[PDB]
């Protein structure tokens, strides 16, 4: 229905989502060890966008959006080999970001791991 | 046809008034139509940060700045010709938006539109005095003018929303072209001429014009910067002090010099001063209440801006009902009771917002907005009082004083009471208590920025106590500023009651 | 919609439970009161502004209050009881303002009534 992307392994990944409007909706990232898609960061579509981070990744991660291809560009440091997880990117949620809840869309994610 | 007619006009001159009245109404809507069209334009072009703020500031700055010299230009150039020129320039600039090179072009268009509008409101009030020479008839003539100048602020959001829902953004001015054109088609066919003679008019004064324009613009912009940035910066401080001293220089130049641009001698008469003071604090009320109630309807009842504006009809209908009956009451009760009574009723209607409606509901808001509309309608009596004892040329001069005090009152009320409301909202919300359990840092600023921002950050963050707390804090702040405005209004009402002399009466000028 | 409050758990440490009703963001917005036999109604363990729990001076340390958004309810657990309590222990809902609920002031809705025995 929409598009998704992936990233490399260290350094950091970058998602994408063709289509979509995200004028109010919630659009963010999730991860999971082999149990739950806890979540790391999200953006809510307000003036210049409201950014919400997780408790364990605060400051270490940077997330931004481009209003030219609805990209989900991301960057980070402190690539500790403990968050090697089934990373995913989702959008189009009514609210309550960073929580596994009502979502009208989900991607394929990406295959990333650190040794 | 002809731009020189003596004897004023026959018994059909009333139609002329109508031709002016409705037209002025349209002219007082444009700014509102722009404001709710601000986001749309932003989508199509580059707001470029400060450019988007200049877009909304330039029209108020120019209107408050070029209002005194243009009145003298109209007086020495032909009042009918000045009005027609203003209308034609307004129509041409409204058609010029069709070329959407969205750029500095918008700023230039708004500047030219403000310059054109500076010749509309000051000139129309003087033309009303010129056409009507009878106190009993002039009172009921000015009542209709009062309704229009202001039914416009309330009716702006409704028409703007109806226009923006259909058509497109560039229709925001396209509706104003066929309506304004008809104006001139009648403005040349049922208007007299005044054209104050060269006998008492000397050559134009460059220093008076430059000093007045710069002082007025500096004052308005310093007030706006005070409201936006707070009383900590040094540049607005120096700007306001220089503007005040330059206004003092202008007053001292106009006091003693021969044939002054704005003869400051009507303020000696108490009748002029009473109305001049009344207009400022009459506009204070709406400048605060309209915006604050629009935000309250936006947030609490969860309505769209179009419907939020539509819900504010009772304020308009109260004025529309009370204004026509005002001159009849003033003629038989005198002004000393009637004019303060409107301000007092507005104060009562803004008190009932606090005393009775701490958990405000829409019924209380409507039954308060009606009383606020009564004090809105008192502007007709106040305007009448201003032009009660004033010769023709001095009346053409005094229309400028009326309009300048009106606009300054709007700016002052908006800035001061909006700043008070924001400060009260920030102190009542107490965002520092939501740190360890959620909102910290950047998000906190949003929660302090506006009630809508706090509500949506609560919705996104997943913590729900913030939404209820923010809505309660905004309600309390709105009600508190309503009470403060009521106190100011009563205090001003006492002054206006004490100012008006006993023998004064809107009829029997001499 | 007029909110309806139901109470349970009362009877013969004990957990009282009060169920919520029509409400958006139905959390931190329902309190506990009690109508003592000798005295009038009293304020025990409600929610203040910001984030504060206003326990009564008598039962400040004995009582505890908890809330769960899922299946919106409120729980009041009483331990180390004393020669007071008994009473009625009304549930209470805050005065709605529009759809949002919170408001500085008094409570408007009062639930059913009595049957706390100690």
Author numbering:
A (entry chain C): 3 to 10, 17 to 42, 44 to 124
B (entry chain A): 5 to 514
C (entry chain B): 1 to 12, 18 to 123
What did the article's authors report about this structure?
As part of the analysis of protonation sites within QacA that affect substrate efflux, we identified QacAD411N as a mutant that significantly improves the protein's homogeneity to facilitate structural studies. We observed in our earlier studies that D411 is essential for the transport of monovalent cations like ethidium (Et) and tetraphenyl phosphonium (TPP), yet QacAD411N retains the ability to transport some divalent cationic substrates like Ch and Dq, which are popular antibacterial compounds (Majumder et al, 2019). The D411N directly faces the solvent‐accessible vestibule and is likely to undergo protonation or deprotonation during the transport cycle. We employ two Indian camelid antibodies (ICabs) as fiducial markers to obtain the first high‐resolution structure of QacA in an outward‐open state (QacAoo), at a resolution of 3.6 Å. The structure of QacAD411N displays the symmetric organization of two helical bundles 1–6 and 9–14 with the TMs 7 and 8 forming an inserted helical pair (6 + 2 + 6 arrangement) characteristic of 14TM helix MFS transporters (Law et al, 2008; Kumar et al, 2021). The architecture of the QacAD411N structure is outward‐open with solvent accessibility toward the extracellular side. The interdomain cleft between TMs 5 and 8 in LmrP and MdfA is wide open toward the extracellular side with relative angles of 41° and 45°, respectively, that can allow the interactions of amphipathic molecules like detergents through the bilayer (Debruycker et al, 2020). This cleft is narrow in QacA between TMs 5 and 10 (equivalent to TM8 in DHA1) as both helices are largely parallel, disallowing the membrane environment to access the vestibule. The residues in the region of 441–467 form a helix‐turn‐helix motif resembling an α‐helical hairpin (EL7a, 7b) which is directed toward the membrane bilayer, but does not plug or occlude the vestibule of QacA in the outward‐open conformation. The ICab A4 interacts with helical extensions of TM13 and TM14, and B7 interacts with the hairpin loop of QacA. Surprisingly, the ability to efflux did not change in the presence of either B7 or A4, suggesting that they do not affect the transport of substrates through QacA.
